[PDB]
Design an enzyme around this catalytic site. Structure first.
Site, PDB file in Angstrom:
ATOM      1  N   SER A   1       1.569   6.798   9.804  1.00  0.00           N
ATOM      2  CA  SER A   1       0.697   7.901   9.406  1.00  0.00           C
ATOM      3  C   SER A   1       1.182   9.271   9.865  1.00  0.00           C
ATOM      4  CB  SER A   1      -0.743   7.672   9.856  1.00  0.00           C
ATOM      5  OG  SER A   1      -1.330   6.612   9.134  1.00  0.00           O
TER       6      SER A   1
ATOM      7  N   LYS B   1       1.566  11.695   7.055  1.00  0.00           N
ATOM      8  CA  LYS B   1       0.455  12.428   6.459  1.00  0.00           C
ATOM      9  C   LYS B   1       0.613  13.934   6.648  1.00  0.00           C
ATOM     10  CE  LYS B   1      -2.732   8.476   6.667  1.00  0.00           C
ATOM     11  NZ  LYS B   1      -3.235   7.506   7.672  1.00  0.00           N
TER      12      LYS B   1
ATOM     13  N   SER C   1      -7.106  10.245   9.875  1.00  0.00           N
ATOM     14  CA  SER C   1      -6.121   9.216   9.499  1.00  0.00           C
ATOM     15  C   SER C   1      -6.577   8.304   8.364  1.00  0.00           C
ATOM     16  CB  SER C   1      -5.585   8.463  10.672  1.00  0.00           C
ATOM     17  OG  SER C   1      -4.189   8.207  10.516  1.00  0.00           O
TER      18      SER C   1
ATOM     19  N   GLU D   1      -0.113   4.096   0.741  1.00  0.00           N
ATOM     20  CA  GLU D   1      -0.891   3.345   1.720  1.00  0.00           C
ATOM     21  C   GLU D   1      -1.496   2.107   1.064  1.00  0.00           C
ATOM     22  OE1 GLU D   1      -0.574   6.237   4.935  1.00  0.00           O
ATOM     23  OE2 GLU D   1      -0.825   4.061   4.727  1.00  0.00           O
TER      24      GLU D   1
ATOM     25  N   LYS E   1      -0.501  14.440  15.196  1.00  0.00           N
ATOM     26  CA  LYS E   1      -0.814  13.405  14.216  1.00  0.00           C
ATOM     27  C   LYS E   1      -0.222  12.092  14.701  1.00  0.00           C
ATOM     28  CE  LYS E   1      -2.470  11.463  10.648  1.00  0.00           C
ATOM     29  NZ  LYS E   1      -2.771  10.383  11.640  1.00  0.00           N
TER      30      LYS E   1
ATOM     31  N   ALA F   1       0.477   4.301  13.318  1.00  0.00           N
ATOM     32  CA  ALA F   1       0.656   2.940  13.798  1.00  0.00           C
ATOM     33  C   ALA F   1       0.918   2.021  12.613  1.00  0.00           C
ATOM     34  CB  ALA F   1      -0.558   2.444  14.592  1.00  0.00           C
TER      35      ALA F   1
HETATM   36  O1  LIG Z   1      -7.103   1.331  10.619  1.00  0.00           O
HETATM   37  C1  LIG Z   1      -6.223   0.949  11.385  1.00  0.00           C
HETATM   38  N1  LIG Z   1      -5.524  -0.203  11.252  1.00  0.00           N
HETATM   39  C2  LIG Z   1      -5.603  -1.214  10.265  1.00  0.00           C
HETATM   40  C3  LIG Z   1      -6.672  -1.289   9.379  1.00  0.00           C
HETATM   41  C4  LIG Z   1      -6.721  -2.291   8.432  1.00  0.00           C
HETATM   42  C5  LIG Z   1      -5.708  -3.232   8.357  1.00  0.00           C
HETATM   43  C6  LIG Z   1      -4.631  -3.178   9.234  1.00  0.00           C
HETATM   44  C7  LIG Z   1      -3.551  -4.187   9.152  1.00  0.00           C
HETATM   45  N2  LIG Z   1      -3.087  -4.699   8.015  1.00  0.00           N
HETATM   46  N3  LIG Z   1      -2.120  -5.569   8.395  1.00  0.00           N
HETATM   47  N4  LIG Z   1      -2.027  -5.560   9.712  1.00  0.00           N
HETATM   48  N5  LIG Z   1      -2.921  -4.694  10.211  1.00  0.00           N
HETATM   49  C8  LIG Z   1      -4.595  -2.164  10.183  1.00  0.00           C
HETATM   50  C9  LIG Z   1      -5.837   1.772  12.613  1.00  0.00           C
HETATM   51  C10 LIG Z   1      -6.525   2.961  12.634  1.00  0.00           C
HETATM   52  C11 LIG Z   1      -6.312   3.847  13.683  1.00  0.00           C
HETATM   53  C12 LIG Z   1      -7.039   5.147  13.730  1.00  0.00           C
HETATM   54  F1  LIG Z   1      -6.746   5.973  12.689  1.00  0.00           F
HETATM   55  F2  LIG Z   1      -6.699   5.829  14.863  1.00  0.00           F
HETATM   56  F3  LIG Z   1      -8.343   4.958  13.692  1.00  0.00           F
HETATM   57  C13 LIG Z   1      -5.423   3.540  14.702  1.00  0.00           C
HETATM   58  C14 LIG Z   1      -4.710   2.325  14.687  1.00  0.00           C
HETATM   59  N6  LIG Z   1      -3.784   1.758  15.532  1.00  0.00           N
HETATM   60  C15 LIG Z   1      -3.450   0.559  15.007  1.00  0.00           C
HETATM   61  N7  LIG Z   1      -4.134   0.354  13.859  1.00  0.00           N
HETATM   62  C16 LIG Z   1      -4.914   1.412  13.635  1.00  0.00           C
HETATM   63  O1  LIG Z   2      -2.511   0.970   7.452  1.00  0.00           O
HETATM   64  C1  LIG Z   2      -2.236   0.520   8.559  1.00  0.00           C
HETATM   65  N1  LIG Z   2      -2.597   1.114   9.722  1.00  0.00           N
HETATM   66  C2  LIG Z   2      -3.282   2.338   9.876  1.00  0.00           C
HETATM   67  C3  LIG Z   2      -4.190   2.808   8.932  1.00  0.00           C
HETATM   68  C4  LIG Z   2      -4.799   4.033   9.114  1.00  0.00           C
HETATM   69  C5  LIG Z   2      -4.517   4.800  10.231  1.00  0.00           C
HETATM   70  C6  LIG Z   2      -3.618   4.340  11.187  1.00  0.00           C
HETATM   71  C7  LIG Z   2      -3.309   5.163  12.375  1.00  0.00           C
HETATM   72  N2  LIG Z   2      -3.403   6.488  12.415  1.00  0.00           N
HETATM   73  N3  LIG Z   2      -3.028   6.840  13.647  1.00  0.00           N
HETATM   74  N4  LIG Z   2      -2.714   5.760  14.324  1.00  0.00           N
HETATM   75  N5  LIG Z   2      -2.884   4.675  13.532  1.00  0.00           N
HETATM   76  C8  LIG Z   2      -2.999   3.109  10.988  1.00  0.00           C
HETATM   77  C9  LIG Z   2      -1.434  -0.765   8.739  1.00  0.00           C
HETATM   78  C10 LIG Z   2      -0.895  -1.291   7.582  1.00  0.00           C
HETATM   79  C11 LIG Z   2      -0.121  -2.454   7.630  1.00  0.00           C
HETATM   80  C12 LIG Z   2       0.476  -2.998   6.375  1.00  0.00           C
HETATM   81  F1  LIG Z   2       0.756  -4.324   6.472  1.00  0.00           F
HETATM   82  F2  LIG Z   2       1.606  -2.364   6.096  1.00  0.00           F
HETATM   83  F3  LIG Z   2      -0.302  -2.831   5.279  1.00  0.00           F
HETATM   84  C13 LIG Z   2       0.128  -3.091   8.835  1.00  0.00           C
HETATM   85  C14 LIG Z   2      -0.416  -2.544  10.016  1.00  0.00           C
HETATM   86  N6  LIG Z   2      -0.366  -2.911  11.336  1.00  0.00           N
HETATM   87  C15 LIG Z   2      -1.074  -2.011  12.048  1.00  0.00           C
HETATM   88  N7  LIG Z   2      -1.580  -1.070  11.229  1.00  0.00           N
HETATM   89  C16 LIG Z   2      -1.196  -1.372   9.987  1.00  0.00           C
END
Ligand SMILES: O=C(Nc1cccc(-c2nn[nH]n2)c1)c1cc(C(F)(F)F)cc2[nH]cnc12
Ligand SMILES: O=C(Nc1cccc(-c2nn[nH]n2)c1)c1cc(C(F)(F)F)cc2[nH]cnc12
Length: 263
Positions: A45, A48, A105, A141, A209, A212
């Site tokens: 991210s 972004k 995010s 995304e 920003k 993850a």
């Molecule tokens: O939304 C998040 N993660 C997410 C959501 C849905 C699915 C998956 C996923 N899909 N496959 N593996 N993991 C991951 C996420 C959000 C945030 C935030 F923006 F700070 F709130 C921080 C994070 N650090 C690690 N993950 C996150």
């Molecule tokens: O979308 C994802 N993570 C997310 C979403 C929104 C915000 C943030 C974030 N913003 N600031 N820190 N974390 C992270 C995500 C996606 C996937 C996948 F498989 F590629 F779809 C695997 C993941 N493993 C952990 N997170 C993910």
């Protein structure tokens, strides 16, 4: 050569078990401190920022662009959409989408920015236009966060991203009003207190920003206004060998602390 700061970053990396990339620009003298500064890392991210900045650039020639409404449909929701889901069957303006992408995010918001630019390649085209030959956005995304080791998609280097973040937030890649808007958005981020900011003195001001993804990928890019000195730009990227690895924001904080101690 290898500096004392670089040696400490290498020790942090060794203890962490992963791969750490750091780039500092100190605008007091334009000097740089790099660790794996030319290796590629998945941006997640942190990308972004480039998408929002590309829309800001478009807005320089369209005074009403940021007020333009974009429809949010149920099918547009992806995996993390805390702001966009409140607007399903309604609309969000491009300003609202930019704020949601940067400060919360929101992944649906990011997808609307990408679409406004004509797809991932439109984000890359903007990067090239502002002198970044390294950044590439290849996917939308959520798949741009797969973060597979060795995969060039959706990557940049710490050096390139620090240079670009400097040009966007402190330089003249954007018009003055747009640069100020980007800085305001970054300073209002909600997600950053455990990352770079956690390694810096509390008196310093940060706009950042986070990102993850898979492989325990944990990232942060920041503009920093330290007490009593010119601004810094700092990129900290971290990725790990196993797909299911846990996030490690503390490693980013530790890298920032080493950088601050070395000034
Ligand atoms: O939304 C998040 N993660 C997410 C959501 C849905 C699915 C998956 C996923 N899909 N496959 N593996 N993991 C991951 C996420 C959000 C945030 C935030 F923006 F700070 F709130 C921080 C994070 N650090 C690690 N993950 C996150
Ligand atoms: O979308 C994802 N993570 C997310 C979403 C929104 C915000 C943030 C974030 N913003 N600031 N820190 N974390 C992270 C995500 C996606 C996937 C996948 F498989 F590629 F779809 C695997 C993941 N493993 C952990 N997170 C993910």
């Amino acid at each position: 050569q290898t500096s004392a700061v670089q040696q400490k970053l290498a020790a942090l990396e060794k203890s962490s078990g992963g791969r750490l990339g750091v780039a500092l620009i100190d605008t007091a003298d334009n000097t740089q401190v790099l660790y794996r500064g030319d290796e590629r890392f998945p941006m997640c991210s942190t990308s972004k920022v480039m998408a929002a900045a590309a829309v800001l650039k478009q807005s320089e020639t369209q005074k009403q662009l940021l007020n333009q409404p974009v429809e949010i449909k149920p099918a547009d929701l992806v995996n993390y959409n805390p702001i966009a889901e409140k607007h399903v069957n309604g609309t969000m303006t491009l300003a609202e989408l930019s704020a949601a992408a940067l400060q919360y995010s929101d992944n649906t918001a990011m997808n609307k920015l990408i679409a406004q630019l004509g797809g991932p390649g439109g984000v890359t085209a903007f990067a090239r236009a502002i002198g970044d030959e390294t950044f590439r956005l290849d996917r939308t995304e959520p798949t741009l966060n797969t973060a597979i080791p060795g995969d060039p998609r959706d990557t940049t280097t710490p050096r390139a991203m620090a240079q670009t973040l400097r040009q966007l937030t402190l330089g003249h890649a954007l018009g003055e009003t747009q640069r100020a808007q980007l800085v305001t958005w970054l300073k209002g981020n909600t997600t950053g207190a455990a990352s770079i900011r956690a390694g810096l003195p509390t008196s310093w001001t940060v706009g950042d920003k986070t990102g993850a993804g898979d492989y325990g990928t944990t990232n942060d890019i920041a503009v920093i206004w330290p007490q009593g000195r010119a601004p810094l730009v700092l990129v900290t990227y971290f990725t790990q060998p196993q797909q299911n690895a846990e996030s490690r924001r503390d490693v980013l904080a530790s890298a920032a602390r080493i950088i601050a101690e070395g000034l």
